[PDB]
Design a protein around this ligand. Structure first.
Ligand SMILES: [Mn+2]
Ligand SMILES: [Mn+2]
Ligand SMILES: [Mn+2]
Ligand SMILES: [Mn+2]
Lengths: 437, 435
RNA sequence: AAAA
């Protein structure tokens, strides 16, 4: 009969409320979720959907009371809505976490409840979740509890509370290309890994740009039709000794030939130390079978795999569980909305770390990739998420990009980190260091 | 000495504090800027730079009182700092605008001042980001600052720590010099075609055959050797040569655009593609085609969109160079520069506009991320980003919902326009920005 | 300016 209620303020960032609720739900009998109603005339959207997700993923059920506020920018209206809608039952403890919502919502909800329950029969408590030091702080009470390593969340819950659905991703055991280059993926992977370990990445990248991309990536679907491909080849042969084809046949490094010859016999782009040039007979379907997957993987997907493989090891040493706290090829969508793609995701406690990968050394493209990773992690994991971009650029460029796209939030730790070509061989350690600090 | 003090909480968004400060400045004798100190051990950065920029651009002089907080997440540390550092003079009114700062800063600065001062007039206010209203707690007023408070691009970028601001006016646009005496005729001819719903046909012709002919090796159009070899390669592919498509399948309205350039700047020799002779030096080739190609390759679209809104912004009494402009560039200290095609300021909301003739989903999406982040960096968290592309209507609606981020407003802060909007892009922007 |  001594009811204890926890009050949470539902803003546009559902994560903090989830963390606080997960930590305190066991000690409370009722939960009041104060949220915003929708009034387009005042440019105010509703946070009800967030409140619903919070109730669902925290299993509040019938203990949850939803309190709607008409205007979250007006004190008068907030106070009035409170006196009219706030639960009237007799409580012995009212706990308010005022981390979320508008500043006016926080001030007037706090003072309203402090007065309504000033009776010493009722204990009033105020809490705040600090995003900078991952701790729950109580008002007037030195008691400070770090929730950084105590509250955990899985990828599905994180995306769900942020209104994302149809979440799909891959495991190391379920990598798509492992099925496409069956019986050969492992050799292909090791050959590439050995090269990266031998500081050969920059050479591989340069070769991929020229002569590889000039040959296999010059048109929209040249590798889909034998005709166009043979034409592209014929055209290139006109440039003679400067042709990309000659460069491929005469100046391709041995380590690259080793990687190329690690592919299955029916999926190789070369016939000996020569480019395989389809004859007139080759069927368009035959061509695609032999070159599509191979070219796509070599055009970059390999880097994603390599970095993932380097990180899995270290993350297993830690408590992270694949599928829940880390994965590759993440895709999801908001209802009736276009899907997104994130190469690698990692969750440290309740912080999302998104990793985008590019083999590019060019400043312009890498810059754009940075904007992308920053926006995506914010959309799917919240405003306190970290974004990491792994590029094929040198240190000076990486440092410049970090300064270029840096945005201030009040924290001393960076939320946008850029790695470069010199970090590839030891990328796993570099990631472990940046993520787990 | 009936002194009246205004208290502001300095978060990482200085714009609302500047707006509230500019509105209430002439009513208060003292200003207490409460900001955070830096402490790496608690991952707490300092907002002192924003407080400095607020004092500078509000011209507070010695009437500004800096009040540092050591820990903006600790209620006891906040109260102790306030009790020891808040000015002790006799005030008849203490006005606290609690719009900025962390929630703990807001709660405990509000209750500390409400206890300390409230038969003395205590007042709390909050600037609504959604409806542009300064709401009072005790007087229960709600004054709209949407059309009252104005800010220029220099002040806006400076409070957000950006410096070395440069841009171009309508009458200082660069290409006007590249085509002296002829820029008008060139832009009017292009404008006439886009207003005639020829934009989609124009961009198709720019992708092929225009970019096949003039967009190859770096400096291709500045080296006769590179360019003549290139054309000779193209002529080899006679059946589908872009040179044949240029001469035989170019529509009439594009010939009128090409013929609008001066004689020494035309890509065409009569009704054919101009192929340079062997007497043509590197200087001759570059003088004829370099500026014409770069302008037709996309730069023309920046000028077109800018010219379609200039008259509509002057009708609304906005001042060029202060509230709108082209080719904005700036930077942070010792930091790389940024480039924004067009900027517009409605009241005190920044509207950044990124332009591209591209119809590709992937490239337009990357430009969407860029303009979203840039207007956030230089204009704050409540700025609007507009991306004008060449995609069809269905691709713009997808990209709009693709990059939409929920901040609590019903009005979208990321707007995407496409090829269907070019003919009336002036009205499409005016309605989106002001209505 | 709805985990500064
Ligand atoms: Mn009243
Ligand atoms: Mn599914
Ligand atoms: Mn990638
Ligand atoms: Mn542009």
């Amino acid at each position: 009969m001594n009811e204890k209620v926890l009050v949470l303020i539902v803003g546009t960032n559902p994560l903090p409320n989830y963390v606080v609720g997960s930590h305190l739900k066991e000690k409370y009998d009722k939960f009041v979720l104060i949220y915003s109603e929708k009034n387009d005339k005042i440019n105010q959207n509703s946070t009800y959907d967030y409140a619903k997700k919070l109730k669902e993923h925290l299993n509040l059920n019938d203990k949850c009371i939803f309190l709607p506020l008409s205007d979250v920018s007006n004190s008068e209206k907030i106070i009035n809505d409170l006196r009219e809608k706030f639960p009237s039952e007799d409580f012995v403890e009212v706990h308010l976490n005022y981390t979320g919502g508008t500043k006016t919502m926080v001030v007037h909800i706090y003072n309203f409840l402090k007065e309504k329950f000033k009776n010493n029969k009722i204990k009033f408590e105020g809490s705040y979740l600090d995003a900078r030091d991952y701790k729950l702080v109580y008002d007037y009470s030195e008691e400070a509890i770090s929730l950084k390593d105590t509250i955990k969340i899985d990828i599905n819950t994180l995306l769900s509370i942020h209104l994302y659905e149809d979440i799909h991703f891959e495991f190391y055991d379920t990598y798509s290309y492992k099925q496409k280059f069956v019986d050969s993926f492992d050799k292909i992977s090791q050959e590439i890994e050995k090269a990266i370990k031998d500081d050969k990445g920059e050479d591989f990248v340069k070769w991929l740009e020229d002569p590889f991309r000039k040959i296999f990536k010059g048109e929209n679907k040249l590798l889909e039709k034998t005709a166009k491909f043979k034409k592209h080849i014929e055209k290139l042969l006109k440039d003679n000794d400067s042709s990309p084809i000659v460069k491929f046949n005469e100046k391709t490094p041995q380590f690259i030939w080793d990687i190329l010859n690690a592919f299955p016999e029916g999926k190789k782009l070369n016939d000996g130390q020569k480019l395989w040039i389809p004859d007139d007979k080759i069927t368009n379907d035959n061509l695609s079978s032999r070159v599509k997957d191979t070219v796509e993987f070599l055009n970059g997907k390999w880097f994603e795999w390599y970095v993932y493989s380097q990180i899995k090891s270290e993350l297993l040493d830690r408590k992270l569980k694949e599928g829940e706290h880390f994965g590759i090829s993440l895709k999801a969508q908001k209802k009736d909305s276009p899907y997104f793609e994130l190469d690698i995701f990692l969750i440290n406690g309740y912080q999302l770390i998104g990793i985008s990968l590019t083999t590019s050394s060019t400043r312009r493209l890498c810059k754009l990739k940075g904007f992308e990773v920053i926006h995506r992690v914010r959309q799917i994991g919240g405003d306190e998420s970290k974004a990491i971009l792994i590029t094929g650029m040198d240190k000076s460029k990486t440092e410049d990009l970090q300064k270029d796209l840096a945005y201030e939030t009040g924290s001393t730790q960076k939320r946008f980190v850029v790695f470069g070509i010199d970090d590839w061989a030891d990328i796993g350690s570099k990631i472990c260091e940046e993520v787990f600090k």
